[PDB]
Amino acid sequence: SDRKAVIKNADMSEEMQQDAVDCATQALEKYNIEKDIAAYIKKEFDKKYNPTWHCIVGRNFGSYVTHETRHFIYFYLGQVAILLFKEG
Template sequence: MATEKKDKLEPQIKSVDMTDDMQQEAVEVAIEAMDKYHIEKDIAQYIKKEFDSRKGATWHCVVGRNFGSFVTHETKHFIYFYLGHCAILLFKTQ
């Protein structure tokens, strides 16, 4: 079942300032989060904590279907993408 869900969740990158490897990792962590959780704040918390742990603090994550944003981020540490109908904004600040 998890494999079927992953197949359905094809990422659509909308805006990015991040290495290809880090982009892939962001998508993989987001898929893990969506497999484990169904509440948007829990998905965001999982992604944020994983990236803090893997890449160092301080990461921020917003997950949802309808939101606006305007953020300042560290160079090469920003991604905004969709998995299915869910938008994910992930970025790092100092």
């Protein structure tokens, strides 16, 4: 819509990266609270791309996670950072 997608680190097909950005755009259009945004994104990837995804949405965080190959993306959408990854 108005928000700039900047992908920072991805281990993920470009189709799926575009999905991630799409999902997060829909989440940001629907929700204002970071946990709700993360939930929307997580639930839709669990549906679309199989469980089990995990999503963190915020302006200030660092992380260290373990993900399945080809199932990791860390990106900005506007001023919010989104970590989305599959493990389990």
